[PDB]
Amino acid sequence: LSEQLKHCNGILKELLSKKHAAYAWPFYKPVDASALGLHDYHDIIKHPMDLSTVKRKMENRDYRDAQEFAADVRLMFSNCYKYNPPDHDVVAMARKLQDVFEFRYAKMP
Amino acid sequence: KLSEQLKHCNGILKELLSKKHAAYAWPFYKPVDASALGLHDYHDIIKHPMDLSTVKRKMENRDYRDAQEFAADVRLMFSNCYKYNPPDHDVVAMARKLQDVFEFRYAKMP
Amino acid sequence: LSEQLKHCNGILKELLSKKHAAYAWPFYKPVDASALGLHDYHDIIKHPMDLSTVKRKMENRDYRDAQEFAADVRLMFSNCYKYNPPDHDVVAMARKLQDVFEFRYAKMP
Amino acid sequence: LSEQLKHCNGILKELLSKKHAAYAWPFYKPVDASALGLHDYHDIIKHPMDLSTVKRKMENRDYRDAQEFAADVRLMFSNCYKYNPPDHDVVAMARKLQDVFEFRYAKMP
Ligand SMILES: Cc1cc(F)cc(C)c1Oc1ccc(C(C)(C)O)cc1-c1cn(C)c(=O)c2cc(-c3cnc(-c4ccccc4)[nH]3)oc12
Ligand SMILES: Cc1cc(F)cc(C)c1Oc1ccc(C(C)(C)O)cc1-c1cn(C)c(=O)c2cc(-c3cnc(-c4ccccc4)[nH]3)oc12
Ligand SMILES: Cc1cc(F)cc(C)c1Oc1ccc(C(C)(C)O)cc1-c1cn(C)c(=O)c2cc(-c3cnc(-c4ccccc4)[nH]3)oc12
Ligand SMILES: Cc1cc(F)cc(C)c1Oc1ccc(C(C)(C)O)cc1-c1cn(C)c(=O)c2cc(-c3cnc(-c4ccccc4)[nH]3)oc12
Ligand code: NA
Ligand code: NA
């Protein structure tokens, strides 16, 4: 449904909005593993995902339905939990942004 | 009878049911008692109720095809809670704390 | 071959280099159809491609071989030719950058 | 590259190296002011600068001498000090990276 993907577009705009910027910013663009010297990042994370990639896929009309959109957003969070120790700042930030995502996604008509 | 991935999923379920998480897991142990709570619209809004006892029985019955089906049921349980409730309800805060345990352990699956 | 994709990474770095910026810049990021007022862009171009997308796919190890890399770079140029009239400045820039790409790609060991 | 610009290239490689990544990463690419909701960033900062811009200029042989290189690196730090309050994490990181830069630059033959 166009209606479902319109709601998904609204969720993405919320995740990218200034009120969430203090915990969303690590997810705005791909993790720059090369720049950070994370030589194992692409060994451990086979399918990187970030909000810019989700936005481009939405603009390109690449999502068949809301479930495909949700799978990419959850992949982004799962990658973060998979790669990082539980006490890293970025894990606390992922959890805060995921709470926003899961709540808005659950309210989809 | 359980695959390596579904054995890890069984370990996650045992953790979600364990005493250390009881202070925020207990609302998810059994079905939402809509009658007792006076929730006359609960089953109008939530078409597919799910709780940890349902997931446990499906695991014991070997009803899960793979880890993704397990994760879908656990996320359905949390999504039902977010769908029905306002964001400031105590049960939503509890759902978020338990979901953080689930998502972290699920992501670390060999 | 790792060797082939290493050469492809060298080609991408050349396409992104300052010496080609005068004709490469329209290809650095996805076409901003909203900003340009291009209401039909995503109706006509079903599979957008740009050098930032190619770079992310390379870093993610999404390319199986040099041929898959070349197919995405040629898709980027083909989208530009498909959407635009032959006298548009962006078509002249696409041709100049494609000459750099085709020449370097042909010289691959 | 001249002898002095070869030393400047060695400084750039050090600033981009893994040992400094914990405080260098905010300077790797242009500040994404739009993504962070910093609506006034380009009103306050007239000449953005970052290590990727310096690296592209160095690769293109655009620096006339070591002083032009030093001016761009100091502009990057000055932009950070100009825009930010003194207690922001990014200001502490700028100071740590600038200490590496100033020390190595001073030792240039
Ligand atoms: C969010 C965050 C806070 C912080 F204080 C330091 C870092 C490095 C940090 O994470 C990032 C900062 C910048 C970027 C850019 C913009 C360069 O792409 C990415 C991250 C980052 C994002 N995500 C989603 C991660 O999962 C992740 C992991 C790491 C990381 C960096 N260093 C480690 C690390 C190093 C040694 C041992 C174990 C982990 N892990 O950095 C990020
Ligand atoms: C955890 C919790 C704390 C609290 F202070 C009040 C309630 C109702 C609460 O949640 C439950 C308490 C008991 C039970 C029993 C054991 C009787 O089944 C269930 C819940 C409960 C669990 N789940 C998973 C829910 O999604 C949910 C929703 C509600 C609920 C009750 N009232 C509301 C509500 C109030 C105002 C506006 C909208 C919804 N929502 O209660 C539960
Ligand atoms: C390069 C260039 C020169 C120019 F004079 C005018 C434009 C629009 C132009 O192209 C772009 C300028 C900016 C951007 C941004 C940065 C906003 O994303 C994109 C383009 C651009 C890139 N690509 C790859 C294109 O294929 C394309 C097509 C168009 C375009 C805009 N208007 C037309 C057009 C006009 C009349 C009839 C048919 C098409 N075509 O703009 C771009
Ligand atoms: C380094 C750092 C730590 C942190 F906890 C939060 C932020 C926002 C941060 O800075 C950045 C994080 C990500 C990025 C990306 C990769 C998105 O481009 C950039 C910065 C960042 C880099 N530089 C060089 C800055 O000067 C700057 C300033 C800010 C910033 C964000 N918010 C403020 C601010 C807040 C209140 C009053 C004034 C300024 N300043 O963020 C950056
Ligand atoms: Na060919
Ligand atoms: Na900006």
Which method resolved this structure?
A: X-ray
Can you tell me which residue has the tokens 């029985």? Answer: B57
DSSP class of residue A63?
Answer: -
Nearest to B26 by CA among B71, B103, B81, B69: B81
* Residue D108 tokens, joined: 């240039």
**Min CA distance, A103 vs chain D (Å)?**
22
| Contact yes or no for A20/A97 (Cβ under 8 A) | yes
Sign of CA dihedral B63, B68, B69, B71: positive
All residues of chain C having their beta carbon less than 8 Å from the beta carbon of residue A33 are 59
| Partner-chain contact C19 D60, CB within 8 Å | yes
- Give Cα separations from A95 to A102, B72, D4 (angstroms): 10, 18, 48
Q: How far is Cα of residue B3 from the mean position of the Cα atoms in its chain?
A: 21
* Cα C92 to Cα C80, C81, C98, distances in angstroms: 10, 10, 10
Name chain A contacts of C33, Cβ cutoff 8 Å. 59
CA nearest to A103, candidates A16, A21, A4, A14: A14
Q: And the tokens for B10? A: 């069984």
For residue D82, give the ligand nearest its CA: 4
Give me the amino acid identity at B95: A
CA geometry: angle B6, B12, B16, nearest 5 deg: 140
Q: What resolution in angstrom units was achieved for this structure?
A: 1.8
What Cα–Cα distance (Å) separates residue A45 from each residue in A40, A63, C101, D81? 8, 22, 30, 36
* DSSP one-letter string for C29-87: S---HHHHT-TTHHHH-SS---HHHHHHHHHTT--SSHHHHHHHHHHHHHHHHHHS-TT
- What lies within 8 Å, CB to CB, of C87 at 6+ separation is none
Q: How far is the CA of D50 from the centre of ligand 6 (A)?
A: 12
Tell me the two tokens of residue A4: 């479902």
Residue that has been written with the tokens 């953080």 in this structure: B100
CA distance B20 to B22: 6
